[PDB]
Amino acid sequence: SGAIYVGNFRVVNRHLATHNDWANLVWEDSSRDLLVSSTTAQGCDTIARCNCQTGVYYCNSRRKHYPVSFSKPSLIYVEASEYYPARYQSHLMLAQGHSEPGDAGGILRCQHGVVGIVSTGGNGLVGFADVRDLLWLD
């Protein structure tokens, strides 16, 4: 994990991308923190086709699954990190919850499938990058 595997696609946080990812680039967006690359093998995940605003995600720092309620995707100002300058991030869904450096890449699921991936966090909020608009993944 750290990645969504759907079809012949690998979806990751843009700043966690590997060299192999960029070599096999299909699509990326700085403003969303998403990168998609191609795979040879068939992936097991399905992207959720819904507007669910609750689900379960895996927290890396805690090593646990947590149920969570999150807001609808929006433009959110995000402070400078060592991965980006201060900027607006789009399609970011926010939740109250525990959040640390290294939690990016945890997958958020509902009963319909994959909803998004931890991208940001801090000030008692976990920020998830929504992937449900990416219908071409399925």
């Binding site: 450096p101 290294g102 990016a104």
Partner: peptide, 4 residues
């Protein structure tokens, strides 16, 4: 954002 994250990833640390």
């Amino acid at each position: 954002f994250r990833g640390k």
